[PDB]
């Protein structure tokens, strides 16, 4: 009975064992629960040994009941066994051993996800939520110690900027991993609480993680170094002397010594002394920085004194782009805000004045028509560019004045003006107006290639009927607009695209036919200018009109359209160059004929002029112009009449007779068809030489009698 009470005390000093969850690390709690469960199992298997039950059976045979009730009820063995076996599946494996040896922040993150996924096994256990919260606090304390050790080894302070930034980026993503894994665990304990309303009466958490204040310190460090870097950027940028004051070198040395004196102070000390050192360092840094901040603001004032235009003010406001958040230059922006709004309003009114002139009345339509842009797509590009400049102005104003410039009266009327300009600058209505016009008109090419149409030309009462190719200019402009608007993101309907593709596949024949028709019309106009040579190009005009009459029966979808177009272009080009060469050589022939009157009376110059005329007529015969001998005969009568007039002058100058007469009378006649050989016919004297000059005598042969009366 005494040893039974000894056993009762020996297991009552163990079954009442409990560890405070707020004290110690998490691993101490894990080891305590494992050791308590193992020792409880050890005294359980020692309790169930048969000799102990033999002593209880002996004491039951001795009617000593009180020891048996003490060993049955006052033990507390079963409740503690249910406690250590209820907490067993959470406690079996636990991942802080990987965290304690981890050295890299991704290993910290994967140990965090391992720990928080192992924490998900609370839902099948009777673990108290408050003890779980203190366990989470101990996990946070171990996290803070481990990453403080990692950050102390990495020495983030004295080292360069970019990799220091990336290690705090990885640390802050580790903090974000802690945040959302705690969110998942918190809703897990919330759904656990929703099943045990009458059991747990402690709703709120009020958890304060130990690392969090250090996180705030790192956060402060983040923006602090960011500010310093931005300040150093403008301090190497704008501080150059505009073409060497001691103020700029004093600013570079003040920034350098301020950063050195704040580099002396350690920032990883999370304690109260470290906190007051941090605060003193930042107060000293702000006191050192505010002087060069006032210098920067004063130089901004002096730089804005000489700035006139809106783009100038925007370009110099964007020089101090990294200092918009420092709360001293914001007052300078606030003082100069009204001038910025007024001058941007003037720029908006200038753009509104541009758009006030309509598109066909402006030079932009003319220069787009020069650079091969159809007018509706040019108007769309014009309106889109004015809208893009309006958006750029609003973007610049919003970026310099901060988000929240709407609430002022000037800002709200500027926004009203921009809204009015933007709803005046819509481009969709022009597009479906064009689409409605094209779909109503219902273009497309088919049928035969040519078209005769009779118009009323001014200066002529009779209606002149002309020939064109069956290809409207609106077809070509529609193809251009489809190719332009399909680029611009605008949805064009199916029939318009199919018509444009048919036009694009039929275009190279149509443009060549248009060029050939225009060349033929211009050459016929040039022929109709000079009526005297209409019978020389009768064969070429007959050939070209035969080709036109052959090709007028062709259809657009024919197979004969490919060589016929090339044949027509070649024939019209040959006809045009023949007519131009004929014009040049006929001007030469007329100049040589009109120079026979002023040529002085001798045989040699007359023979040379006649040889030049014969050479020109020979070159006419080489290219085989039609009806050459008739035109040569019509020229021959004229030059014989001119020779008769010159014979009158030469005979009346004399008033040895035949020696003076043979100057003109032995001149060779003009031979039209002289390239022919083989026919052995000999021309007589009257058709080889001008023997009929006395028949073309202008005053009659009476002057010849005046030549005969003097002898």
């Amino acid at each position: 009975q005494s040893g039974v009470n000894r056993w009762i005390r020996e297991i009552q000093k163990v079954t009442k064992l409990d560890r405070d969850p707020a004290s110690g690390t998490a691993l101490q709690e894990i080891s305590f629960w494992l050791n308590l469960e193992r020792a409880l199992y050890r005294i359980q298997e020692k309790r169930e040994s048969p000799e102990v039950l033999l002593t209880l059976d002996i004491l039951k045979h001795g009617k000593r009941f009180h020891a048996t009730v003490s060993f049955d009820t006052d033990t507390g063995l079963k409740q503690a066994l249910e406690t250590v076996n209820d907490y067993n599946p959470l406690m079996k494996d636990f991942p802080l051993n990987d965290l304690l040896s981890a050295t890299e922040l991704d290993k910290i993150r994967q140990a965090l996800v391992a720990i928080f996924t192992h924490l998900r096994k609370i839902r099948n256990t009777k673990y108290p939520i408050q003890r779980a919260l203190r366990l989470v606090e101990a996990i946070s304390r171990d996290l803070s110690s481990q990453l403080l050790k990692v950050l102390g080894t990495r020495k983030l302070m004295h080292v360069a900027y970019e990799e220091f930034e990336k290690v705090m980026v990885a640390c802050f993503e580790v903090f974000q991993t802690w945040d959302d894994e705690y969110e998942k665990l918190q809703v897990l304990l919330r759904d656990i609480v929703k099943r045990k309303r009458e059991e747990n009466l402690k709703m709120v958490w009020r958890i304060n993680p130990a690392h969090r204040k250090l996180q705030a310190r790192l956060d402060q460090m983040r923006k602090f170094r960011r500010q310093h870097e931005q300040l150093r950027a403008v301090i190497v940028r704008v501080l150059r002397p505009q073409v060497f004051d001691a103020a700029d070198a004093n600013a570079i040395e003040e920034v350098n010594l301020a950063y050195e004196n704040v580099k002396e102070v350690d920032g990883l000390d999370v304690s109260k002394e470290g906190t007051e050192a941090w605060e003193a360092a930042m107060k000293r840094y702000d006191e050192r920085i505010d002087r060069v901040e006032t210098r920067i603001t004063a130089r901004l004032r002096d730089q804005l004194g000489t700035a006139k235009n809106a783009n100038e003010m925007f370009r110099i406001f964007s020089r101090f782009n990294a200092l918009f958040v420092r709360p001293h230059i914001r007052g300078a922006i606030r003082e100069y805000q009204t001038q910025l709004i007024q001058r941007v309003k003037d720029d908006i009114e200038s753009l509104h004045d541009k758009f006030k002139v309509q598109y066909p009345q402006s030079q932009a339509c003319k220069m787009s028509h020069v650079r091969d842009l159809p007018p509706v797509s040019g108007s769309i590009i014009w309106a889109k560019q004015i809208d893009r400049q309006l958006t750029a102005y609003m973007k610049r104003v919003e970026d310099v004045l901060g988000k929240g410039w709407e609430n002022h009266v000037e800002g709200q009327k500027l926004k009203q003006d921009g809204d009015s300009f933007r709803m005046k600058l819509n481009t969709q209505e022009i597009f479906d107006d064009w689409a409605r016009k094209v779909q109503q008109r219902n273009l497309g090419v088919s049928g035969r290639i040519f078209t005769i149409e009779s118009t009323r030309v001014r200066g002529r009462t009779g209606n002149v009927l002309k020939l064109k190719v069956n290809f409207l200019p609106e077809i070509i402009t529609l193809s251009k607009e489809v190719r332009n608007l399909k680029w611009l993101g605008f949805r064009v309907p199916l029939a318009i695209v199919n018509k444009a593709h048919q036009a694009n596949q039929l275009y190279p024949f149509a443009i060549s036919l248009i060029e050939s028709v225009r060349t033929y019309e211009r050459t016929c106009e040039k022929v109709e200018e000079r009526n005297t040579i209409s019978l020389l190009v009768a064969g070429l005009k007959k050939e070209v009109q035969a080709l036109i009459a052959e090709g007028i029966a062709l259809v657009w979808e024919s197979y004969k359209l490919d060589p016929y177009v090339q044949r027509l272009a070649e024939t019209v080009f040959n006809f045009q160059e023949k007519v131009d060469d004929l014009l040049i050589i006929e001007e030469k022939i007329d100049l040589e004929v009109r120079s026979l009157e002023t040529c002085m009376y001798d045989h040699k110059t007359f023979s040379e002029i006649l040889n030049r005329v014969q050479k020109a007529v020979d070159d006419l015969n080489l290219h085989s112009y039609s009806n050459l001998p008739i035109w040569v005969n019509k020229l021959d009568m004229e030059i014989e009449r001119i020779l008769g007039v010159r014979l009158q002058a030469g005979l009346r100058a004399w008033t040895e007779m035949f020696a003076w007469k043979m100057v003109v009378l032995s001149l060779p006649r003009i031979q039209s068809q002289r390239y022919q050989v083989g026919v052995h016919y000999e021309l007589t004297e009257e058709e080889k030489f001008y023997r009929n000059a006395l028949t073309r005598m202008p005053d009659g042969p009476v002057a010849l009698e005046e030549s005969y009366s003097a002898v």
């Binding site: 007959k542 036109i548 009459a549």
Partner: peptide, 25 residues
């Protein structure tokens, strides 16, 4: 012997005949 000239027709009556050829066929 001298051969008489060939001459292409007047343009107006030529493409008037071709206009009739276009309309009839």
């Amino acid at each position: 012997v001298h051969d008489k000239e060939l001459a292409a027709e007047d343009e107006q009556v030529f493409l008037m005949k071709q206009q009739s050829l276009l309309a009839k066929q």
